[PDB]
């Protein structure tokens, strides 16, 4: 097409607040890491850009048995892994690559990486080894999963970053050179961009993959920059030095959108932001103390000061853009007198001392707000600040007492918040994504039942009840569902804040 033809060509410079931590997405859990990897690797199925809808990817079609127990995937033929300076052999993707990618996480003998701090965190956290009974390559283009029970989220899970398809040929090559760590540094995938370079804490360069199996990327190159100060990042947009950015200072949004040639995209979001309370530690193991903390923080005021109104008050663990949200639950009321009384009832009439962890990139006013709120009931909060990589590591190991936490949905399903972040299964994995170490049988058992039926209304009933239990238990302080807010130059088209895996750049183009 002629309108289409004009979309091709150019360089996009994207900027964000913290670098990624790996080029193997199975080893990490954070959005910043996935900026790069989500462009490099494909999965068996994928989400249609801008949406939460599943469509084919490295599998062209699939059949699911009507008891939910067997999933047969028919793999795309003629797909080749990237050639780069460090891997110049041209190899066709096949069933053995799916087996490598999954079986390394499933079977500890096939871990591939040396013993050390590397961990398949999502796989462990989710209990994927409990879910899958077997994986078979029936032929070079056919993979069959057999499950130990029905698992409603399973198809959508196969779209998630941790189940990206790595190259078994490349792995084997690195193993024989004793350079296995490079699998996570110098990546090889099938996606619409390939890796060119990664300068830690500075930039990653992606180049168009001319041989991509799907519709070709418009852009020739993407430069993903790390600019940690969000004001500096916005000034870089204002000068044209960068072209699209995440994580704006919300008190600058209004001035940005007034400037010529800047657009600020905004949508409701699939995001939640809260305070973890480590329920296995002193004080935070007492429900009355947690309830006091809940009643002492004015979330309406928090959203005004921290988010400048670009957020909705959080009530349940996941946002109301996802089905199954419990609209009947009332948020805990801000009430200082009640909070004080609760602490007195718990045996702490003069409060106690504790610590909050925060990140160097978050607005510093957040931690200060919590400190101030809790000081009103006699809780003396010390603030400790960490860079992002270190923050993920330390909170992953349960070092915190209180810490800020946040999640962007991977899939539009409550399982991706409730089970992945709040279940006993999740709390059992070390490092953990259940940063409150919340351990409730009654809660977790409802989430297990909800995996085992696929009818959405039936699952909804179980999830509504689960949201009641976690609210009663108050193992955290819910704060906000932030809006997605993304400033960019008006010439940058095709980017979407909606849906999941939003930082894939294959649809983005420069208007000409």
């Amino acid at each position: 097409s002629v309108k289409e033809q004009k979309r091709f060509g150019g360089v996009l410079v994207f900027a964000r607040g913290a670098d990624g931590s790996s080029m193997d997405p199975a080893l990490v859990t954070d959005g910043e890491s996935y900026v790069a990897t989500g462009n490099i690797y494909d999965t068996l199925v994928q989400f249609k850009y801008g949406t939460t809808e599943i469509e084919p990817a490295l599998a062209t079609s699939w059949d699911i048995s009507p008891d939910g127990l067997v999933y047969t995937f028919h793999l795309r033929k003629g797909v080749y892994f990237h050639q780069t300076k460090y891997w110049n052999k041209k190899v066709e993707f096949s069933a053995k690559d799916v087996l490598f990618s999954f079986e390394r996480q499933m079977d500890k003998a096939k871990r591939y990486y040396s013993p050390g701090a590397k961990s398949y965190k999502y796989w462990e956290g989710m209990g994927m080894s409990h879910i899958i009974k077997s994986i078979e390559a029936l032929d070079d283009y056919t993979i069959r999963f057999t499950l130990n029970g029905p698992e409603a989220p399973f198809l959508a899970n196969l779209g998630m970053d941790f189940l990206s398809i790595l190259s078994k040929d490349y792995a084997d090559y690195l193993e024989q050179n004793n350079k296995k760590d490079e699998l996570a540094k110098k990546p090889v995938g099938t996606g619409p961009f390939k890796f060119f370079l990664w300068n830690k804490d500075e930039k990653i360069i992606l180049l168009k993959n001319q041989d991509y199996w799907g519709p070709k990327a418009y852009l020739d190159k993407v430069v993903v920059r790390t600019i940690p100060n969000s004001s500096t990042r916005a000034l870089a947009l204002r000068t044209g030095e960068i072209m699209l950015m995440t994580g704006p200072n919300l008190n600058e949004v209004e001035q940005l959108e007034k400037l010529p040639n800047i657009v600020v995209d905004k949508s409701a979001g699939l995001l939640a932001s809260w305070l973890s309370l480590n329920t296995q530690k002193k004080y935070f193991n007492n429900p009355l103390v947690r309830l006091a903390i809940n009643h002492a923080i004015n979330v309406d005021d928090y959203i005004k000061v921290i988010y400048e109104g670009f957020a909705q008050k959080m009530v349940n663990p996941f946002p109301p853009t996802i089905w199954g949200y419990n609209y009947n639950i009332k948020p805990y009321e801000y009430d200082l007198k009640k909070a004080k009384e609760l602490l007195k009832q718990a045996g702490y009439p003069n409060g106690f001392k504790t610590t909050i962890f925060t990140t160097s990139t978050r607005n510093p006013k957040g931690a200060v707000f919590i400190q101030a709120s809790l000081a009103k009931i006699g809780i003396d909060v010390k603030i400790e600040v960490y860079e992002w990589g270190a923050y993920l590591k330390r909170t992953g190991l349960g070092e915190h007492e209180m810490a800020f936490a946040g999640w962007m949905a991977d899939i539009a399903d409550p399982d991706n918040f409730l089970y992945t972040l709040w279940s006993k299964q999740a709390a059992s994995a070390i490092p953990t994504q259940n940063g409150s170490f919340y351990k409730s049988d009654a809660f977790s058992d409802l989430l297990i039942k909800a995996k085992r039926v696929s009818d959405q209304k039936e699952r909804e009933a179980l999830y509504l009840k689960a949201q009641e239990i976690i609210h009663k238990d108050a193992p955290y302080v819910p704060l906000a569902y932030p809006y997605s807010v993304v400033p960019h130059l008006s010439k940058v088209k095709g980017y979407k804040t909606t849906g999941v895996s939003v930082n894939r750049f294959f649809k983005v183009y420069l208007e000409k």
Side-chain angles (χ1 to χ4, degrees):
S1 157
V2 69
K3 197 142 69 47
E4 278 291 310
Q5 172 63 56
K6 311 328 171 86
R7 293 183 179 190
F8 289 88
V11 183
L12 174 68
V13 180
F14 174 97
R16 50 71 177 286
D19 197 10
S21 294
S22 188
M23 295 284 162
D24 183 340
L27 301 184
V28 288
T29 64
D30 68 294
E32 299 287 15
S33 297
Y34 295 160
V35 175
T37 63
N39 283 284
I40 293 171
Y41 303 98
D42 290 312
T43 37
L44 293 171
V45 308
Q46 69 192 28
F47 298 98
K48 172 170 173 188
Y49 188 72
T51 83
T52 67
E53 306 166 13
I54 295 169
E55 66 183 3
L58 294 176
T60 45
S61 65
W62 53 92
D63 305 293
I64 308 175
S65 63
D67 46 22
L69 294 179
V70 184
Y71 292 64
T72 305
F73 292 88
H74 308 281
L75 310 182
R76 194 177 297 272
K77 299 187 188 195
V79 174
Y80 288 89
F81 283 97
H82 296 147
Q83 292 162 290
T84 63
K85 90 184 191 171
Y86 53 78
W87 175 248
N88 43 42
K89 189 168 211 217
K90 177 217 193 47
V91 302
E92 187 180 1
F93 155 68
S94 70
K96 70 177 192 187
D97 301 306
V98 179
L99 295 182
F100 169 63
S101 295
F102 286 64
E103 288 186 335
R104 75 199 177 118
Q105 305 192 56
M106 192 163 64
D107 180 342
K108 296 336 168 59
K110 293 170 170 173
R111 159 180 174 93
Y112 181 85
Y113 297 110
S114 299
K118 289 177 159 68
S119 174
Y120 298 117
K121 295 175 233 205
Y122 259 101
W123 182 286
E124 292 302 306
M126 289 171 64
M128 290 289 289
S129 292
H130 304 305
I131 295 174
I132 301 167
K133 182 180 182 193
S134 64
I135 313 177
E136 315 167 71
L138 302 175
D139 71 13
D140 292 345
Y141 303 100
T142 315
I143 285 281
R144 174 171 287 168
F145 293 93
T146 303
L147 307 189
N148 285 311
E151 184 69 43
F154 190 71
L155 188 62
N157 288 346
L158 299 179
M160 289 177 63
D161 302 78
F162 80 106
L163 302 175
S164 290
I165 303 314
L166 281 64
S167 174
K168 178 57 149 99
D169 295 314
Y170 180 53
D172 285 348
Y173 157 85
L174 295 179
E175 184 169 35
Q176 289 182 314
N177 290 142
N178 213 322
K179 279 150 70 82
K180 291 186 318 187
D181 284 337
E182 297 199 334
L183 189 62
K185 294 177 171 99
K186 298 210 268 174
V188 174
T190 59
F193 297 92
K194 63 195 171 175
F195 182 98
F196 183 71
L197 92 55
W198 179 16
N199 295 343
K200 180 173 155 165
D201 305 329
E202 294 172 8
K203 65 183 178 177
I204 295 154
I205 301 173
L206 306 172
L207 294 172
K208 175 172 175 172
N209 175 15
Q210 297 300 332
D211 295 326
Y212 174 56
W213 59 266
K216 305 293 179 280
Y218 300 121
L219 296 159
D220 299 317
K221 175 170 154 180
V222 181
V223 184
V224 172
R225 295 187 59 196
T226 305
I227 302 180
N229 182 294
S230 301
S231 301
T232 304
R233 198 184 318 122
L235 177 56
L237 185 65
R238 285 163 53 207
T239 61
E241 179 181 317
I242 67 114
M243 302 163 62
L244 168 66
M245 55 171 277
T246 58
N249 272 333
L250 293 156
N251 68 13
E252 302 175 7
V253 169
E254 188 209 274
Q255 297 317 318
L256 283 172
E257 59 200 330
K258 288 178 172 174
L259 298 180
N261 307 318
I262 289 165
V263 165
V264 182
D265 293 353
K266 300 180 210 61
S267 64
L270 289 172
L271 299 153
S273 183
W274 65 98
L275 182 72
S276 293
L277 308 170
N278 188 331
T279 62
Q280 301 311 309
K281 290 182 174 177
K282 185 176 191 178
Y283 315 109
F284 305 101
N285 67 11
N286 185 330
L288 301 186
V289 168
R290 302 190 298 262
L291 286 165
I293 291 177
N294 279 259
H295 289 292
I297 295 159
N298 188 337
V299 175
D300 293 325
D301 191 52
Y302 184 92
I303 286 170
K304 226 169 278 173
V305 169
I306 301 316
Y307 291 100
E308 301 274 349
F310 290 96
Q312 188 174 334
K313 174 191 279 152
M314 183 179 179
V315 179
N316 296 305
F318 63 92
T321 43
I322 298 176
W323 63 269
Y325 186 90
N326 191 327
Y327 294 96
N328 202 58
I329 288 164
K330 305 155 106 58
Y332 286 117
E333 283 173 33
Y334 175 58
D335 181 339
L336 288 190
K337 196 180 137 180
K338 179 174 193 46
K340 285 169 187 197
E341 179 58 28
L342 288 161
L343 284 181
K344 191 130 90 198
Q345 290 188 14
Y348 299 104
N350 307 123
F352 53 91
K353 294 170 56 163
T354 189
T355 296
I356 189 162
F357 283 12
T358 186
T359 63
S360 55
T361 54
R362 283 186 70 85
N363 179 354
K365 286 188 316 221
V368 166
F369 191 106
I370 303 300
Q371 176 186 63
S373 293
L374 298 189
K376 292 184 184 141
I377 67 167
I379 293 163
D380 179 14
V381 178
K382 176 193 197 265
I383 299 168
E384 289 183 3
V385 185
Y386 298 94
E387 298 299 311
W388 184 234
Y391 187 89
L392 293 168
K393 173 183 181 51
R394 295 177 184 276
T395 55
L397 299 176
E399 293 186 16
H400 60 286
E401 287 181 71
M402 312 192 301
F404 290 101
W407 194 248
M408 165 66 189
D410 303 307
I411 67 167
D413 190 300
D415 182 86
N416 177 256
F417 293 69
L418 299 177
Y419 200 82
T420 301
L421 313 174
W422 302 98
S423 64
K424 292 173 68 170
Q425 170 64 45
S428 78
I430 299 157
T432 187
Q433 318 201 80
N434 182 343
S436 299
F437 292 83
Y438 180 51
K439 292 174 63 170
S440 165
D441 285 317
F443 176 81
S444 293
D445 288 348
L446 292 164
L447 306 183
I448 294 161
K449 285 180 193 278
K451 295 169 173 294
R452 307 276 175 267
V453 287
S454 57
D455 179 80
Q456 187 172 119
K457 282 269 182 225
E458 293 173 50
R459 294 183 71 203
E460 180 169 36
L462 295 154
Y463 290 133
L464 297 174
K465 293 194 179 64
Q467 288 167 79
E468 296 174 357
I469 297 173
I470 192 169
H471 174 81
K472 169 199 64 99
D473 289 335
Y476 73 126
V477 188
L479 296 173
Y481 303 123
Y483 298 170
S484 175
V485 186
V486 171
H488 61 87
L489 305 174
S490 57
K491 71 173 86 185
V492 177
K493 303 305 193 177
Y495 185 84
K496 282 181 176 16
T497 60
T498 59
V500 297
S501 191
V502 306
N503 295 312
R504 291 176 286 165
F505 303 119
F506 57 170
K507 316 304 179 184
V508 176
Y509 66 97
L510 308 181
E511 190 160 66
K512 289 163 182 61

